[PDB]
Every structure is written in C-alpha cells, then in structure tokens.
Amino acid sequence: VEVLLGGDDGSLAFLPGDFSVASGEEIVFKNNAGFPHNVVFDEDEIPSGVDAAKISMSEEDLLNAPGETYKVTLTEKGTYKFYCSPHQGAGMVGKVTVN
Ligand SMILES: [Cu+2]
Numbered sequence: 001v002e003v004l005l006g007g008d009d010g011s012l013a014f015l016p017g018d019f020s021v022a023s024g025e026e027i028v029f030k031n032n033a034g035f036p037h038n039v040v041f042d043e044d045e046i047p048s049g050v051d052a053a054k055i056s057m058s059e060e061d062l063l064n065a066p067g068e069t070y071k072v073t074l075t076e077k078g079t080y081k082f083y084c085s086p087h088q089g090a091g092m093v094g095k096v097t098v099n
Contacts, residue, residue, distance in 0.1 A: 006034035047078030
C-alpha cells in the first residue's frame with residue numbers, strides 16, 4: 001500500500017490514515033506536501049513483542065523534499081499507531097491493522 005504524507009494542499013494528514021494490510025505487505029510512505037514529515041511508531045500502541053525502534057524512522061531523519069519515501073514491512077498481526085513527530089499535535093497520526 002502507498003500512503004501520502006500531507007495532502008497536496010498542505011493538510012497535515014496521512015492519506016489514507018486508517019488502513020489494513022496483510023502481514024508481510026510493504027507500506028510505502030511517500031512525502032507529498034506540508035513537510036517536513038516522518039513516520040514514528042508509538043511503542044505503547046503496537047503489538048506485544050514488536051520493537052518500535054526497528055520500524056520507526058531515526059529521530060533526526062525528516063523527509064524534506066517531494067517524493068522522498070520511507071518503506072517498512074510489518075509482520076506481527078494487530079493494530080499499530082504511528083505519527084508524524086513534528087505534526088503530532090496537529091493531528092497527523094494514523095493507524096494500520098495487520099492481518
Ligand atoms: Cu508531518
């Protein structure tokens with residue numbers, strides 16, 4: 001699945017923001033507008049036994065140009081909350097269910 005970071009109008013949203021994937025399906029986050037953006041998983045809101053540090057972007061790594069991507073693959077079934085660090089207070093948060 002591909003997820004855009006920001007609407008074209010600069011709206012601070014993942015598109016789509018709540019979605020489902022199969023275990024082992026790749027998630028392509030594509031930087032769109034309103035950046036900088038990144039993708040960090042909330043370690044309190046992902047399945048047991050998953051280390052959020054392996055699937056989250058590095059804290060200083062921000063996507064700052066159109067079309068840059070971050071790709072991640074999730075295998076443990078369950079629901080995962082993630083967010084964009086700079087825009088988390090503005091509502092830029094999303095959820096992926098892995099089945
Ligand atoms: Cu952002």
